[PDB]
């Protein structure tokens, strides 16, 4: 039993949250190029046989609601769960279109005791977002 069982009827959901345009009230920069990412991911995970759902420009409230609702689905016939977050961020934080939400609040919905039909199944969160404002200057090889 070294490998997850991936031969359930369905590979599982792939939820892609693609936040490009943010409310003026926040000022955050429009994330040019993120639509290329979202389409790339949609096609990539389609070829992996995931049930992809693309969602664009979600408020922090809408993100929490979508994650809550998805966590309350019956995943019994699904091998895994994938969630992709494309947005601005800070350490521990991703931005809805109207402000920051803790990553922990999003992932907590899928905890082993809170989403029983994903127990023992891989829950993947793929996060394209800043985690601070440091730059890596690199070092010559």
């Amino acid at each position: 039993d070294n490998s997850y069982k991936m031969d359930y009827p369905e590979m599982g959901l792939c939820i892609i949250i693609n936040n490009k345009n943010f409310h003026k009230s926040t000022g955050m920069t429009s994330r040019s190029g993120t639509d290329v990412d979202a389409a790339n991911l949609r096609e990539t995970f389609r070829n992996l046989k995931y049930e992809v759902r693309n969602k664009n420009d979600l408020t922090r409230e809408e993100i929490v609601e979508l994650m809550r609702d998805v966590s309350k689905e019956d995943h019994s016939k699904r091998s895994s769960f994938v969630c992709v977050l494309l947005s601005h961020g800070e350490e521990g934080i991703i931005f809805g279109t109207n402000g920051p939400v803790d990553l922990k609040k999003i992932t907590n919905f899928f905890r082993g005791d809170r989403c029983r039909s994903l127990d023992g199944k891989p829950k993947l969160f793929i996060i394209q977002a800043c985690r601070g404002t440091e730059l890596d200057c690199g070092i010559e090889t």
Binding site: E91, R111, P122, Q128, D136
Partner: protein
């Protein structure tokens, strides 16, 4: 009898704790570009951690920022794999 409630999560972060993450306005983000390329090339051949390790190398080696602003120019990035998985993951 029980498993930890935090078990079986994998967080594939685009960048290291504390750091900016880079996105190209025409090509897409460095990390998602590389992630999709490595999944396309290796999802039928490689376990997921080894796929993500090749993503790390691709982002680390083939990308460097170009900016008219010298303070943002010639910068690098390393993604950050955070695994609480208990098993190997193959997509085939």
């Amino acid at each position: 009898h029980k498993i930890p409630v935090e078990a079986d999560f994998l967080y594939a972060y685009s960048t290291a704790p504390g750091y900016y993450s880079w996105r190209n306005s025409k090509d897409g983000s460095w990390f998602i570009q590389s992630l999709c390329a490595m999944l396309k090339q290796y999802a039928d051949k490689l376990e997921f951690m080894h796929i993500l390790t090749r993503v790390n190398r691709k982002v680390a080696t083939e990308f460097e920022s170009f900016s008219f602003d010298a303070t943002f120019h010639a910068k690098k990035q390393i993604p950050c794999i955070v695994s609480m998985l208990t098993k190997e993951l193959y997509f085939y």
